[PDB]
Design a protein around this ligand. Sequence first.
Ligand SMILES: N[C@@H](CCC(=O)N[C@@H](CSc1ccc([N+](=O)[O-])cc1[N+](=O)[O-])C(=O)NCC(=O)O)C(=O)O
Ligand SMILES: N[C@@H](CCC(=O)N[C@@H](CSc1ccc([N+](=O)[O-])cc1[N+](=O)[O-])C(=O)NCC(=O)O)C(=O)O
Lengths: 208, 208
Amino acid sequence: PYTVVYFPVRGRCAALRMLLADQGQSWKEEVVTVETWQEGSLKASCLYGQLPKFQDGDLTLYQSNTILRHLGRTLGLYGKDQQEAALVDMVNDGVEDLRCKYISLIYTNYEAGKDDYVKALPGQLKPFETLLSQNQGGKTFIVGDQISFADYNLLDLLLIHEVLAPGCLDAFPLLSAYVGRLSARPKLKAFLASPEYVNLPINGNGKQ
Amino acid sequence: PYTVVYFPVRGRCAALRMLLADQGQSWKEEVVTVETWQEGSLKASCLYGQLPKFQDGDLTLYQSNTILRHLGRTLGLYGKDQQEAALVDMVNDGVEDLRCKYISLIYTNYEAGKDDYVKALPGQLKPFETLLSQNQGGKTFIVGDQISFADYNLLDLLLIHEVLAPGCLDAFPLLSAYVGRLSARPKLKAFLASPEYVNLPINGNGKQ
Ligand SMILES: N[C@@H](CCC(=O)N[C@@H](CSc1ccc([N+](=O)[O-])cc1[N+](=O)[O-])C(=O)NCC(=O)O)C(=O)O
Ligand SMILES: N[C@@H](CCC(=O)N[C@@H](CSc1ccc([N+](=O)[O-])cc1[N+](=O)[O-])C(=O)NCC(=O)O)C(=O)O
């Protein structure tokens, strides 16, 4: 089965969890406390000395995007052809780029860098609105007419940014509608309202 | 066919170029000067306002790793099955993580951060030596027994680090032999020695 090993936060596991829940997959959560991590044995055993760690049968993986791509690949959420698969990759890489900036702000310069970050947000979000606009008027998914792992990753990015800068999507009709539409999918809606998601901090340092 | 649109530097296009050359694929280079970029029209037309931009027929792509994964997918350099594909992803994400740190040092604080960076390098290279040690004694490739896009990306990462920290691979026998072995592949060896590779700077700011 599936096992996700992570700290008690949404962070880089939020998207893959949304994917698993929405896809009706069952998985086990292995919560790692700061004490256990500080112990050192687990960390030393991690390929890049970091979490998340993921297990699928006897397959052990590291790197959040590797887990997303693996789930996308094995579950059929990676486009209908090579052309779509590439576009899905293009979206996820763009999502990762912004997530990195978001993470830097959160853990590195929240107080002094928030104003500038929020000021620059529109230009960073615009590309995803454009992508939607070029795909069936933005009425379906980010790429093609079937959901992909990039959709879950983008959704999370949009959700955490609405927390960081409420109303940041107001100027973007497609992104706004997209968030509402995907968040309304039955299994996903139930997961997002559940305590295991709601009662977990977004980041490990309490900022958001 | 293939068209690479980039500034006159190796940077984030070095790995994909090595891949194309080694695979015997033809491609065209579209060099973008600082003046043309500063003009603004090209940049505004780029999905995320950045280069590289790649064209495969009428398919236009952005994001260096998206290009690598697309070429890996289409040319059969993405593992023999789904499991290997995930391991390939795990390697590339690790390569990207280190490349980001390298890029930060180069463009953000080379002078004051070099010492610390080089001091931390061994711990950052270790995971790749470990992966090699676990795959046929490190006698073939980073994943499985066939070359993958992650091999080209990792090779470039190792090459630019030996320039930044001459001798850094002395502490890693497998990685050292791996660099020598892959660099000896006939088509790649010819490309690496060619003016089109050699006469290009590694980075855009002249640091290395
Ligand atoms: N590329 C990896 C990134 C993994 C990662 O960043 N892991 C962190 C999560 S927390 C984290 C992630 C990013 C930043 N940050 O400042 O960029 C700060 C924190 N933190 O705990 O403060 C971790 O395991 N840290 C434990 C360790 O290294 O010993 C992935 O995508 O899965
Ligand atoms: N995620 C993308 C990243 C593309 C990228 O970083 N492109 C830069 C290359 S130069 C670059 C890349 C990283 C850093 N940096 O400081 O981290 C500095 C520079 N630079 O030109 O100084 C660019 O196009 N810049 C033009 C622009 O944005 O207007 C990819 O993987 O392809």
